[PDB]
Amino acid sequence: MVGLIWAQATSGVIGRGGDIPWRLPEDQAHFREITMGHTIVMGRRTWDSLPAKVRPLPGRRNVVLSRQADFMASGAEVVGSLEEALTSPETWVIGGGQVYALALPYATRCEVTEVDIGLPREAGDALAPVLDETWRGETGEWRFSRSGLRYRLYSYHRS
Ligand SMILES: NC(=O)c1ccc[n+]([C@@H]2O[C@H](COP(=O)([O-])OP(=O)(O)OC[C@H]3O[C@@H](n4cnc5c(N)ncnc54)[C@H](OP(=O)(O)O)[C@@H]3O)[C@@H](O)[C@H]2O)c1
Ligand SMILES: O=C(O)CCC(=O)c1ccc2c(c1)OCCCO2
Ligand SMILES: [Co+2]
């Protein structure tokens, strides 16, 4: 099982300036629950976005995808191809935009947090991947984050 997990604005923006223009504590707990115990695969830029005191994320096989053969990610594995990282029963791709696109052929689940924030796409933004007709979606109710933004969870899946 390869799954993708991400939060996006209604516009599809997931990242800007190397970070994320919101923060939902409820989404971070949801992320931790879904990924805990499993492999997490991330692009090098997303590894960079994590503070050093946070990496690796605890209780998970942290895998960083990079083309630099000497890139050092302390506490993590660095692989040069996505296929290298798929040696566990559950693998969650945690971003960012480039790695979601690379991983989507392998994926049968997307746990998507839609954040009710009006955020026009700008040059250089990272974007959510486009899900084609093979994906079946189930939606939750709109909920209020304590940060003041509404959000809702979509669970997409396909055989
Ligand atoms: N909203 C969310 O839920 C969420 C979650 C995660 C990240 N984000 C945001 O997304 C943004 C980063 O996403 P990004 O698309 O800019 O970069 P990214 O996907 O996180 O990492 C890009 C890097 O991955 C490596 N890479 C990409 N394709 C590869 C391949 N085919 N083989 C080997 N290595 C490969 C390269 O690393 P080298 O350059 O080292 O080769 C590339 O520079 C940040 O803003 C981050 O905050 C958002
Ligand atoms: O998982 C934990 O241990 C606590 C929450 C956390 O560390 C976290 C939550 C969301 C993330 C993230 C980390 O980095 C990946 C890119 C953005 O999505
Ligand atoms: Co689990």
From Swiss-Prot:
Keywords (A to Z) from UniProt: NADP, One-carbon metabolism, Oxidoreductase
SUPFAM superfamilies: Dihydrofolate reductase-like
Reaction(s) catalysed (UniProt annotation): (6S)-5,6,7,8-tetrahydrofolate + NADP(+) = 7,8-dihydrofolate + NADPH + H(+)
Gene3D superfamilies: Dihydrofolate Reductase, subunit A
A matching Pfam family: DHFR_1
Binding site for substrate: I5, W6, A7, D27, R32, R60, Y100, T113
GO cellular component: cytosol
Record comment: activity regulation: Inhibited by isoniazid metabolites. The prodrug isoniazid is metabolized to isoniazid-NADP adducts that inhibit the enzyme at subnanomolar concentration.
Domain DHFR: 1-158
Binding locations of NADP(+): 6-7, 14-19, 43-46, 65-68, 80, 94-99
Pathway where this protein functions: Cofactor biosynthesis; tetrahydrofolate biosynthesis; 5,6,7,8-tetrahydrofolate from 7,8-dihydrofolate: step 1/1
Family as reported in the entry's similarity comment: Belongs to the dihydrofolate reductase family.
UniProt xrefs under PANTHER family: DIHYDROFOLATE REDUCTASE (PTHR48069:SF3)
Protein name: Dihydrofolate reductase
Species of the source: Mycobacterium tuberculosis (strain ATCC 25618 / H37Rv)
